[PDB]
C-alpha cells in the first residue's frame, strides 16, 4: 500500500535506483483522517506491536487551556479560521495540529466569574450591562469575599483576549493530533502569537 | 549442515618428470628400503620439506625467542623421539642435514628386516602385510608405521602368530594331516 521507504526515491547524486525488495509491512503508511467538525465518530487502528491509535473522523468538543490562568475546560469547537500549511483545510474546516480555531468562550467565562467575581466582555450594551450589574451584585459570603480579595490585584487580563469575549468565541490553536490520538485539544491564543494571527486574519 | 572435515595431501610430484639423476636416486632409495612406489619417496620429501621450511624459518630467527625456542624444541623432540635424530643432535641445525635415507629407516619393514625377523626386506613387507608382526602389545599391519625408540625394543611375532605361538595355518592344516 502506501509506503514510507526511501528506496523509491532518487539518490542525492540524482541516480534512479533499482528495485531491491518487495514492499515491507514495517514501512507502511495509511490514509489521513481529515478530521471534520461534527458528531463524534472515532475509529480505532491496530498498529505495530499490538498498539492502538484513534482516527478522529469527526469531533465536537476539545479540551482547551488558558495558559496564563492555569486552567483548562472542555469547551466546543466552532470552526477553523486559519491553517499555516493549506487554506484548503480552513475552507473546509479540517482539524489538524496548529489549526487556528474558534472555541466556545462560555466555560472560561464561568470560571473567570466564579474564581474571581469580575466579568469579561466589557461591552456596554443592554444585555452586557444587565449581566455586569447582575454579576457585580451577586450574593457572596464573607469568607468567599475575602478569598476573592486574596485573588484580587491580578484580576484584569490582556486587552486582546477579553475583547473577544464579547462574541463568546475565542481564538485557539490545536495542539493535539486528532488523526493519531482521537483528541482535538489546544490552548487559547495569547500575546505575540495572538497579534500575529490577528494580523494574518484581518489583514 | 554439519561442519566440514579437514583433510590434506601428503606428497607432491616433481616439476620435472624425467631427470636421470633424480630418477636413479629414487630407484636407489626404493631398492634400499623395499618401497612400493615413488610416492613413498615423495611423502618423505614433502614432510621433510615442510619441516625444513618451518625449521629454516626458525633458524633464521634469534635464539631465546619464545616462538623460536618453543617451536624449534618441539620439532627437535618430535624428531629425536621417532629415531630420526639421535641423542647428541638436539641443536635444530642438524635437522637440515637430514636425508630421505633417514626417515626410511624407521619403517616397520626396515626394522623387521634389520633384527632378523625376515630373510629379506621383501619378506619383511609380506610378513607385515600378512599379519605376523607385533609392536609391543599392538599388532601393526602398516609397513610405513614409524617406530619410535620406545617401540624399538617391543617388536616381535604376534602373540597369536603362526610364527609366535598358535595354530599354524591353512597350508599346514591341509598338508600335514596327510
Amino acid at each position: 500500500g502506501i509506503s514510507r521507504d526511501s528506496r523509491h526515491k532518487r539518490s542525492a547524486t540524482g541516480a534512479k535506483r533499482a528495485q531491491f525488495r518487495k514492499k515491507r509491512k514495517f514501512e507502511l503508511g495509511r490514509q489521513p483522517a481529515n478530521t471534520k467538525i461534527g458528531p463524534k465518530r472515532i475509529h480505532s487502528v491496530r498498529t505495530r506491536g499490538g498498539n492502538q491509535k484513534f482516527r478522529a473522523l469527526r469531533v465536537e468538543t476539545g479540551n482547551f487551556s488558558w495558559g496564563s490562568e492555569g486552567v483548562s475546560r472542555k469547551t466546543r469547537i466552532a470552526g477553523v479560521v486559519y491553517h499555516p500549511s493549506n487554506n484548503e483545510l480552513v475552507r473546509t474546516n479540517t482539524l489538524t495540529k496548529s489549526a487556528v480555531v474558534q472555541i466556545d468562550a462560555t466555560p472560561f467565562r464561568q470560571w473567570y466569574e466564579n474564581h474571581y467575581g469580575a466579568t469579561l466582555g466589557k461591552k456596554k450594551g443592554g444585555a452586557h450591562a444587565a449581566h455586569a450589574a447582575e454579576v457585580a451584585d451577586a450574593k457572596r459570603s464573607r469568607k468567599v469575599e475575602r478569598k476573592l480579595a486574596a485573588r484580587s490585584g491580578a484580576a484584569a487580563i490582556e486587552s486582546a483576549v477579553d475583547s473577544q469575549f464579547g462574541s463568546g468565541r475565542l481564538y485557539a490553536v490545536i495542539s493535539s493530533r486528532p488523526g493519531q490520538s482521537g483528541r482535538c485539544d489546544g490552548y487559547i491564543l495569547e500575546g505575540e502569537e495572538l497579534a500575529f494571527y490577528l494580523r494574518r486574519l484581518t489583514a | 549442515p554439519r561442519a566440514p572435515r579437514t583433510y590434506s595431501k601428503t606428497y607432491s610430484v616433481p616439476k620435472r618428470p624425467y631427470e636421470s639423476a633424480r630418477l636413479d636416486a629414487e630407484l636407489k632409495l626404493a631398492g634400499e628400503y623395499g618401497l612400493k612406489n615413488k610416492r613413498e619417496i615423495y611423502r618423505i620429501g614433502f614432510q621433510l620439506s615442510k619441516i625444513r621450511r618451518a625449521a629454516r624459518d626458525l633458524l633464521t630467527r634469534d635464539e631465546k625467542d619464545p616462538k623460536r625456542l618453543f617451536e624449534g624444541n618441539a620439532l627437535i623432540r618430535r624428531l629425536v623421539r621417532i629415531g630420526v635424530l639421535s641423542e647428541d643432535k638436539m641443536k635444530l641445525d642438524y635437522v637440515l642435514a637430514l636425508k630421505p635415507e633417514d626417515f626410511l629407516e624407521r619403517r616397520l619393514q626396515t626394522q623387521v628386516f634389520k633384527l632378523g625377523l625376515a630373510r629379506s626386506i621383501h619378506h619383511a613387507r609380506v610378513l607385515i602385510t600378512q599379519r605376523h608382526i607385533a609392536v609391543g602389545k599392538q599388532i601393526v599391519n602398516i609397513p610405513s608405521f614409524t617406530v619410535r625408540l620406545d617401540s624399538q625394543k617391543h617388536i616381535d611375532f604376534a602373540h597369536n602368530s603362526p610364527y609366535g605361538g598358535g595354530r599354524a595355518g591353512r597350508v599346514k592344516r591341509k598338508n600335514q594331516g596327510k
Binding site: - | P1, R2, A3, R5, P66, L69, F70
Partner: protein, 260 residues
C-alpha cells in the same frame, strides 16, 4: 528475516563452550533470560559437557524435570537456561555446588563450592534512576532489579545479593585499588587489581589494571567486574589458578615438572 531465530548452528555457538565440531549440525540455543546469549552458559552445556552427569540431552531433560537442578537457589527446568557470570548452581541430590567463574584460559571452569558459599553472589550496577512513585532502583548485570538501594551507590559498583530473599547484603564503591576480574576482551578470565581509569567523554572509558605478578594491562571499562575491596581478598572462591596467565612455555615446563 520475518522473525526471531530459534536455532543456533554449532559453528555459530560461542567458542567458550568447547563444543566439538562433528557431533551434529546444531548447538543449544540459550533461552532469553538474565544474561546475554553470547556471554552466558546454558545449563545443558554445564550439566552435560562439563560434569558428564548426563550422556545426552534427553537425560538432561530427565534430570531437570525432577527438581534436581537449581540456579541461584531457585529451581529451573529450562534446559537452555542462560546461566552467566556469578550464577550459583546448586545440586542437592548430588550434594554439590558450583559457581560460574571465568578461568584464566578464558572459559567457565568447573568450580566446586560449598553449601554455605552457594548462597550469595555479586552484581555490577548498570545504572541508577527513579522509577514510578519516585522509588530508586539499581539494575545489575544479571537483570535483577533491587528497589531502595544505598543512596550512595552508582554505576560500575558490585553488590552482594542473597540467593534466597533477593536482598542486598553489602557492596563496593568503584575507585582505584579494587580487586577486579575482566568480563570480556582478550584479558578474559584473568584476575587483576585496579591501577588507574582514564575518562573519555562520548567514547569508551579505559581502565589500567595489574595482576599479582607485575603486569599492567588495559581493558574496556565495560569489561571490569569488581570482585573485592583490596588485593588478595575476593568475595567468592577462585578456581585452580587464581586467575594469573601463564605462557605456553611456562605451562609446558610445569607439565613436565609435575609429571616427573
Amino acid at each position: 528475516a520475518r522473525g526471531p531465530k530459534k536455532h543456533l548452528k554449532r559453528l555459530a555457538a560461542p567458542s567458550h563452550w568447547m563444543l566439538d565440531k562433528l557431533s551434529g549440525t546444531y548447538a543449544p540455543r540459550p533461552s532469553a533470560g538474565p544474561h546475554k546469549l553470547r556471554e552466558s552458559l546454558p545449563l545443558v552445556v554445564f550439566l552435560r559437557n562439563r560434569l558428564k552427569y548426563a550422556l545426552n540431552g534427553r537425560e538432561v531433560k530427565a534430570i531437570m524435570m525432577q527438581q534436581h537442578v537449581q540456579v541461584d537457589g531457585k529451581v529451573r527446568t529450562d534446559t537452555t537456561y542462560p546461566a552467566g557470570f556469578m550464577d550459583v548452581i546448586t545440586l542437592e541430590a548430588t550434594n554439590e555446588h558450583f559457581r560460574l567463574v571465568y578461568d584464566v584460559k578464558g572459559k567457565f571452569a568447573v568450580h566446586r563450592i560449598s553449601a554455605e558459599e552457594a548462597a550469595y553472589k555479586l552484581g555490577k550496577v548498570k545504572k541508577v534512576q527513579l522509577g514510578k512513585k519516585g522509588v530508586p532502583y539499581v539494575v545489575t548485570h544479571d537483570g535483577r532489579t533491587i528497589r531502595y538501594p544505598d543512596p550512595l551507590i552508582r554505576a560500575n559498583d558490585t553488590v552482594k545479593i542473597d540467593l534466597a530473599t533477593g536482598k542486598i547484603d553489602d557492596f563496593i564503591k568503584f575507585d582505584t585499588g579494587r580487586l577486579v576480574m575482566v568480563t570480556g576482551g582478550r584479558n578474559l578470565g584473568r584476575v587483576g587489581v585496579i591501577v588507574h581509569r582514564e575518562k573519555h567523554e562520548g567514547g569508551f572509558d579505559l581502565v589500567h589494571i595489574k595482576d599479582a605478578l607485575e603486569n599492567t594491562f588495559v581493558t574496556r571499562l565495560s569489561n571490569v567486574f569488581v570482585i573485592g575491596t583490596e588485593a588478595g581478598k575476593p568475595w567468592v572462591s577462585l578456581p585452580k589458578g587464581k586467575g594469573i596467565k601463564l605462557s605456553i612455555s611456562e605451562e609446558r615446563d610445569r607439565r613436565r615438572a609435575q609429571q616427573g
